[PDB]
Amino acid sequence: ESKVVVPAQGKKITLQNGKLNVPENPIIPYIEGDGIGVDVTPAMLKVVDAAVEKAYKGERKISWMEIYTGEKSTQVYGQDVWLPAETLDLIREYRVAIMGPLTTPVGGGIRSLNVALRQELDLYICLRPVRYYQGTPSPVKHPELTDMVIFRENSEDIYAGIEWKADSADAEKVIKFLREEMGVKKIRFPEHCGIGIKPCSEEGTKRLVRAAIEYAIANDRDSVTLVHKGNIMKFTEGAFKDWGYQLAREEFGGELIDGGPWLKVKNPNTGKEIVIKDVIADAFLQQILLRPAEYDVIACMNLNGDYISDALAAQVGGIGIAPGANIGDECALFEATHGTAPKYAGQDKVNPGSIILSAEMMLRHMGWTEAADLIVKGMEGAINAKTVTYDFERLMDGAKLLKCSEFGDAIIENM
Amino acid sequence: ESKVVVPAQGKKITLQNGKLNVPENPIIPYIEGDGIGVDVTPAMLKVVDAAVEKAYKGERKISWMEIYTGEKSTQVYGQDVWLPAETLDLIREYRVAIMGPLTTPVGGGIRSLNVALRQELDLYICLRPVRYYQGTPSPVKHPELTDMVIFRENSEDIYAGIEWKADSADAEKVIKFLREEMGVKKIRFPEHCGIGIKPCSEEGTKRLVRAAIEYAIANDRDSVTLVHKGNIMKFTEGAFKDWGYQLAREEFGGELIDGGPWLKVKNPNTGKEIVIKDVIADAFLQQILLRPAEYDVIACMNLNGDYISDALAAQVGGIGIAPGANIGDECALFEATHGTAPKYAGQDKVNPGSIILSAEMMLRHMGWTEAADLIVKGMEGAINAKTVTYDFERLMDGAKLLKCSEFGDAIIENM
Ligand SMILES: NC(=S)c1ccc[n+]([C@@H]2O[C@H](COP(=O)([O-])OP(=O)(O)OC[C@H]3O[C@@H](n4cnc5c(N)ncnc54)[C@H](OP(=O)(O)O)[C@@H]3O)[C@@H](O)[C@H]2O)c1
Ligand SMILES: NC(=S)c1ccc[n+]([C@@H]2O[C@H](COP(=O)([O-])OP(=O)(O)OC[C@H]3O[C@@H](n4cnc5c(N)ncnc54)[C@H](OP(=O)(O)O)[C@@H]3O)[C@@H](O)[C@H]2O)c1
Ligand SMILES: [Mg+2]
Ligand SMILES: [Mg+2]
């Protein structure tokens, strides 16, 4: 008994030849989000509607359709309905959707609803661009040097969720198999030992890296860096790196730079030579602080991508305004990347910048680049004006403190 | 046919009741290290001898004994001798040793000689303190707020080196077992798929965390933070966190703070209440930049520790002066934490600060705290004086450029 209401006015986005066909009146599902979702989502809807209205002079308008996942879903659909099958169907059917932060319960056997959405819908790209907005308080000296785009593999790695508890019958069965059938002698303590499995495939790797290189081409970026810990994990992380370079050679004409191992890929549109290179993951966490200007598009596995995107967001002062998308071949889900911060829920206090910039990505994904540009311009102006929410204000001198809703308005005021 | 020469003058350190018994004339094995090892090691020997001479007025003296691992070992012992069994025996027998950076070959089937040393000798603690030295050029605004000590688990995690290549008979055998016998359906692409195993045990976890809490007590530190990605890896990383808290409760009288989950442990010597807490790994990489003063002793698994120690070293401008130890119940191996940087080898150019501060840790481990304090004082003075090696100098104005050897001398000059 669906409680979703399909908008009377509005038409479904469709997909033909890997190209989105977006009508003037697209229906866009949104999940409000739990906790501060109640604050940031209304601000997002208003900012997006204003950008769309202004950009296309009223010719285009989104028909927002609320759908459910998280604690709110339990209130709507019932007790154990954290992720209704209907939500998976609707996101796939309508092609483009956006969500606030989600509450995943503890003590009931769910790792992460965000991860569940990504995997169930096969949204294999976690796309997280990290740039600096002039005027943002930052813990680093030169945050303006950071302008990167993270392509985080979203469907494999240790995120597969394949593991067994220490002392469980299953764990002991796996360990026995490893020691006795596979001849494994490297388990230091085989008793009271939890076990996890890390898969990495050629297909999984290459579809991710393919998207990263296509993005570098489409957006005239300077380089793609494969980040990995392949010196220790030779057959997963090392394989990821090798397959990435191979893909560049086989599909994009990548040629050896000097004596290797870096490659150059010719941008078929601009003639720019895009560098394909690689950095070991621990060293990369140093490089993003010490030589940020040398990095651009980043391609990495699921866990590394999780870490890198957080580290980069922190350094640009963007912990609360970091945008994110999850993109697959059939649909895409844009998301606030911060948590539910329930202590502030309903106080109209927190920064709606993250979900707003994820909506910017959404508009851009829809081909509505003018509306997207207006959001960027608005965000830039508001931050430059020092008219900001508490999280920025408390780190600044001479700023004007704005509520969440009010910061949404300041963004519009600056379009 | 050993090519190691046991010093005529000198006596073996011994171990009784988990307490080192260090004579006035201890024999200390050292590995010179490959590449820039030839530059930084001589500087380390000179600085350490000066600190020891000055601290104890000639009553004490180290008898250095060269031992081998890495490319130099192949030159001494022969073609495929990258890690002679003799070196493992000698480090265990003499209890305390130090090494420069090592060349691990590529294309011959060795992940890392550093990891091999750690695992073979069961040096389950990777101890990496990260502090700021006034005057060091840093990419962050307030590096002085960083004063942490990393306890990185050194014997388990994905470092166990258990994995199989995509398309290999073994990989397919493991995957078949997983899908057919374990009923695993979560492998997105089971073909052309590499597989790695991640173990985490109660014993492995608790011996690491035990050392971290004992350290916090011995050194009157403020808190121990368990860092993990337990929300996704419930039975490895999540288990690590749970066992860590449990250890604090069961062995150290840890009591609930407020409504949890943090605990307080009473320092039995100073009565200080040590906070035991936890942070998810991605968030922690933000916290170390945004709220560094809130963190002190860190306890984490092998891979997370690898990443965290690099990230912290970068932020204090200490990429080339980060000290490190590997400690087990029977012996300890102190190490330069940077690479071999062969392009500079023999030019007397690079920073010997890392191996020098690892030697400071070594002296402190030996109970020679006065000599260790002299090295710290010397390092602080030299850096404050802006008499520094090229890696610092190029980031500063009005500094005096010193050779590697000369910086070693400046450290002595400042004792
Ligand atoms: N079971 C669940 S739901 C769970 C558990 C762990 C992690 N996560 C995930 O991991 C990430 C972090 O989540 P979390 O739960 O650890 O964070 P939360 O507890 O929800 O938020 C922690 C702090 O981040 C700051 N913050 C978050 N959003 C903000 C905004 N829009 N404006 C200003 N400040 C903001 C606030 O800092 P101050 O209080 O200092 O102002 C807040 O107290 C999220 O992606 C989340 O989905 C989820
Ligand atoms: N197969 C081997 S041996 C291998 C491979 C990968 C990683 N690792 C390990 O991973 C870590 C990093 O090693 P790596 O090989 O990637 O680094 P390296 O190539 O050996 O060094 C890279 C750069 O770091 C800087 N640097 C290193 N030591 C320095 C010092 N003492 N003073 C000043 N600058 C210094 C230099 O930067 P500038 O040129 O800019 O001045 C150097 O070019 C090490 O722990 C290493 O053991 C080992
Ligand atoms: Mg994350
Ligand atoms: Mg490392």
CA distance A356 to A34: 16
**Going from the N-terminus, what domains does chain B have, and what CATH number goes with each?**
1-415 (3.40.718.10)
Q: Which ligand is nearest to the CA of B304?
A: 4
Beta bridge partners of A266: A273
Question: How many Cβ atoms are within 10 Å of A371's Cβ, its own excluded?
Answer: 26
Decide: helix, strand or coil at residue A9: coil
Cα–Cα separations (whole angstroms), residue B291 to A315, A319, A394, B142, B341: 12, 12, 14, 10, 33
| Peptide bond between residue A261 and the one before it cis (omega within 30 degrees of 0) | yes
- Residue with token string 């397919």: B172
* Residue A129 β-bridge partners: A149
Under an 8 A CB cutoff, do A193 and B199 touch? Answer: yes
The nearest alpha carbon in chain B to A153 belongs to B188
CB-defined site of ligand 2, < 6 Å: A 231, 280, 283; B 36, 101, 103-104, 106, 114, 320, 337-341, 350-351, 354, 391
Which helix (H) or strand (E) segment is B277 a member of? Answer: strand B273-280
Euclidean distance between CA atoms B15 and B19, whole angstroms: 6
What length is written for chain A?
Answer: 415
- Residue A156: list chain B partners with CB under 8 A: 187-189
Separation CA B99–CA A382 (nearest Å): 54
Peptide bond into B323 cis (omega under 30): no
- Report the C-alpha gap between B224 and B380 in whole angstroms: 26
Rounded to whole angstroms, the Cα distance separating B178 from B410 reads 59
Annotated binding-site residue? B118: yes
Distance between CA atoms of residues A310 and A101, nearest Å: 16
Q: CA-CA distance, B355 to B322, in Å (whole number)?
A: 8
Cβ distance of A139 and B289 shorter than 8 Å:
yes
Q: What residues contact A286, with CB distance under 8 A and at least 6 apart? A: B310, B311, B313, B314, B319
Q: Which residues contact B268 (CB under 8 A, 6 or more apart)?
A: B217
Site residues for ligand 1, CB cut-off 6 Å:
A 36, 101, 103-104, 106, 114, 320, 337-341, 350-351, 354, 391; B 231, 280, 283
Residue matched to tokens 């990505």: A361
CB B387 within 8 Å of CB B399: yes
**CB-CB neighbours of B271 under 10 Å:** 7
In angstroms, this model's resolution equals 1.9
Determine the distance separating the centroid of ligand 2 and the alpha carbon of B339, expressed in angstroms. 3
Counting ligands in written order, the one closest to the CA of B407 is: 2
Q: Within 13 Å of residue B90, how many CA atoms lie on the same side as its CB?
A: 23
Distance CA B267, CA A31 (A): 48
**Residues 6 or more apart in contact with residue B398 via CB below 8 angstroms:** B386
Q: What is the DSSP string of A288-322?
A: HHH-GGG--EEEE-HHHHHHHHHHHHHHTT-TTT-
Our answer to whether residue B206 is catalytic in this structure is: no
Q: Which of residues 204-233 of B touch A (CB under 8 A)?
A: 204, 229, 231-233
8 Å CB contact of A201 and B189: yes
Pairwise CA distance, residues A154 & A156, whole Å: 6
Per the annotation, does B364 bind a ligand? Answer: no
Of A284, A333, A299, the C-alpha closest to A216 is: A299
Q: What are the distances in angstroms from CA A205 to CA A248, B189, B193?
A: 12, 10, 10
Q: Please give the Cα distance from A90 to A7 (Å, whole number).
A: 13
Q: Which of B89, B220, B282, B329 is catalytic?
A: B282
CB-side neighbour CA atoms (13 Å) of A174: 29
Partners of residue B333 on adjacent β-strands: B97, B326
Spell out the residues 6+ positions from residue B327 whose beta carbon is closer than 8 angstroms to its own: B123, B124, B125, B127, B211, B365
From chain B, the residues in CB contact with A190 under 8 A are 199, 201
Alpha helices, H only, B126-236: 169-176, 202-218
What is the 3 state secondary structure string of A255-288?
EECCCCCCEEEECCCCCCEEEEEEEEHHHHHHHH
Q: What sign does the CA torsion over A241, A243, A246, A247 have?
A: negative
Q: Is B343 on the interface with A (CB under 8 A)?
A: no
> Measured at the alpha carbon of residue A297, what is the angle toward residues A292 and A300, in degrees to the nearest 5?
100
